[PDB]
Amino acid sequence: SFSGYLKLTDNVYIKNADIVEEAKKVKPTVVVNAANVYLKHGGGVAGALNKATNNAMQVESDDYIATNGPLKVGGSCVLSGHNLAKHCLHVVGPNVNKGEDIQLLKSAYENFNQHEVLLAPLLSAGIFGADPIHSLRVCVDTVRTNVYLAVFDKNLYDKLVSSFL
Numbered sequence: 001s002f003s004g005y006l007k008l009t010d011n012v013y014i015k016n017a018d019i020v021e022e023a024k025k026v027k028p029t030v031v032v033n034a035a036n037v038y039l040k041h042g043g044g045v046a047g048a049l050n051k052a053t054n055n056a057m058q059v060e061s062d063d064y065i066a067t068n069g070p071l072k073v074g075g076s077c078v079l080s081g082h083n084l085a086k087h088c089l090h091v092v093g094p095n096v097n098k099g100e101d102i103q104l105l106k107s108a109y110e111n112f113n114q115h116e117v118l119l120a121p122l123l124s125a126g127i128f129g130a131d132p133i134h135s136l137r138v139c140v141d142t143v144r145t146n147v148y149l150a151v152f153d154k155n156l157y158d159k160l161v162s163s164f165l
C-alpha cells in the first residue's frame with residue numbers, strides 16, 4: 001500500500017513525491033488528475049499523467065469530450081487509470097490564472113468523497129495559480145475519505161507540513 005506518508009489528520013496524508021512515480025509504484029484504485037474542463041492534459045500534473053499513459057489518457061479524454069461536452073469548473077469524471085491506477089478521477093479545480101472563482105475549490109474537493117481511498121495532487125495548486133497552503137486547508141476541511149497527497153516540490157512540501165494548523 002502507500003508508504004512514507006506523513007499523517008496530517010484522521011483521513012489526510014502527505015508525501016514529497018512525483019504523483020506519476022507514486023501511481024506506478026502503488027497502482028492505487030484511484031489517481032486524481034488536476035484536469036481542466038476540456039480534459040486537455042497539456043501541463044502540470046495532467047501533462048505528466050498523460051505522458052506516462054503514452055497519450056492513451058488524452059485519446060480516451062477526447063472521446064469523452066466529443067460525447068459529453070466539457071466538465072464544469074468544480075466538477076469531475078471517472079475515466080480509466082491506464083498503467084497508473086484502476087481509475088482516474090479527473091477533477092477540475094478553479095484556475096485563478098484564468099480568472100476562475102476560488103470559491104469553487106471546495107466543490108472540486110467534494111468529488112473525492114465519492115471514493116474511499118485516493119492518490120491525489122493539491123487541487124488548483126501549481127500552474128492553476130491558487131495558494132497551495134489554502135488548497136491543503138480546503139482539502140482537510142472538505143474531504144472525509146482517505147486522501148494520500150503527493151506534493152512534487154520539496155520546498156513546497158516542507159512549507160506545507162511546517163505551516164499546517
Ligand SMILES: CNC(=O)c1cc2ccc(F)cc2nc1C
Binds near residue numbers: 019048126
Ligand atoms: C516522470 N515524472 C514526470 O513526468 C513529471 C511528474 C510531475 C508530477 C507533478 C507535476 F506537477 C509535474 C511533473 N512533471 C513531470 C515532468
